[PDB]
Structure 1
Amino acid sequence: MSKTRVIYPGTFDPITNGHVDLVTRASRMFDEVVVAIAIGHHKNPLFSLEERVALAQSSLGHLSNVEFVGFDGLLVNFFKEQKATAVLRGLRAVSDFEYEFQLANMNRQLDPHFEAVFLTPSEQYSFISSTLIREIARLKGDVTKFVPQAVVEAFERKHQQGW
């Protein structure tokens, strides 16, 4: 009769309707869900950690069993620290599927307790790629269809300065 806690890591740069769907799904089936934002020190994300967490909070705060936290280092260690039952990943048609198996199996070798549990998002979200979203925004196009309003405004606000 133990509580479920799943960790959903990613860069969420920025969060998309697809990510929202997934979290919504996950919130319905796990007791607690942690939206885990990888800082990306060596990665160089467009949006800052604060901006990413803010935007996630805005699109998913209404779910009461959803936490939001940034993290670096090893997902396996974050997993341990958070006393997590499993790491959640999404699985679309566009997904590097062998590349989920590498992640999953290598992490298992680092920690035999590590478990991974994929969910698939509503078919309308099977084709959107944050890379393309960011590119469309950059070229002053409409991303209203692919990300929450808050994110759309973030994009303007990013144009409006330079960082």
Structure 2
Amino acid sequence: MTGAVCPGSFDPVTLGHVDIFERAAAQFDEVVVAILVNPAKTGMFDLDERIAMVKESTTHLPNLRVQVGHGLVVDFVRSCGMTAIVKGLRTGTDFEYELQMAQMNKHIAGVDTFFVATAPRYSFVSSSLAKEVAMLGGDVSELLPEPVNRRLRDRLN
């Protein structure tokens, strides 16, 4: 089997992330979305909620599974019997840092990182900015999956 891991904090998952999941699922036999949480309580959604949002947003991808990650991403990737990470590039991505992490990840565990450009319509959403705008009252519903929109609306109502 070919396979890739798509790691992130997904707090919450965006349509930018889902686009990347779809591309990974199209090109690898199996995809694992690895939810890697904050070292210190700082998130908007708890882990259970993050998991549910990813699952509910990926029902159309039968070769994708969702799991909570622990420790070094490369250790999680190798625990999945894989050697590839797939990550998206968007507007605002710190690409130099992504490159540094990719080189470090290859050095320590031989894990490759494949980068893919997110679809233009979803290229300016990030979890952080979506939350920031949502919390100040703005509408980002067109940039997030409906399972995320539902939960966001509940927190503000």
Compute the displacement of 1:93 (Å).
3.5
> For residue 68 of structure 2, what is the aligned residue in structure 1?
70
C-alpha distance in structure 1 between counterparts of 2:5 and 2:19, whole Å: 15
**1:140 aligns to what?**
137
Deviates more, 1:90-99 or 1:73-82: 90-99
In 2, the alpha carbon distance for the partners of 1:42 and 1:88 equals 25
**Partner Cα distance (2:40, 2:89) in 1:** 25
Tell me the residue number matched to 1:149: 146
Q: What secondary structure does 2:67 align onto?
A: strand
What is the DSSP-based 3-state SS (H/G/I as helix, E as strand, rest coil) of the residue aligned with 2:142?
coil
Whether the aligned pair in 2 keeps the contact of 1:55 and 1:150 (CA below 8 Å) is yes
Q: Which amino acid aligns with 1:98?
A: E
Q: Please report the TM-score for the alignment, with normalisation by the length of structure 2.
A: 0.93
In 1: Cα distance, 2:13 partner to 2:19 partner? 11
List runs of 5+ in structure 1 lacking aligned partners: none
Letter in 2 for 1:84: M
Kindly report structure 1 stretches of 4+ aligned residues shifted beyond 6 Å: none
**Separation of aligned partners in 2, 1:89 and 1:58:** 20
| TM-score normalised according to structure 1 size | 0.90
Cα drift, residue 43 of structure 1: 5.6
RMSD: 1.4
Matched residue, 1:16: 14
Distance of 2:88 and 2:100 partners within structure 1: 15
State the match for 1:125 in structure 2.
Answer: 122
1:26 counterpart = 2:16 = no
Q: Is the 2:16–2:126 contact (alpha carbons within 8 Å) kept by the matching residues of 1? A: no
Number of equivalenced pairs: 157
Alignment partner of 1:33: what SS?
strand
Q: Any conservation in 1 of the 2:20–2:88 contact (CA below 8 Å)?
A: yes
Please report how far the alpha carbon of residue 139 of structure 1 lies from its aligned counterpart in structure 2 after TM superposition: 1.8
% same residue: 41
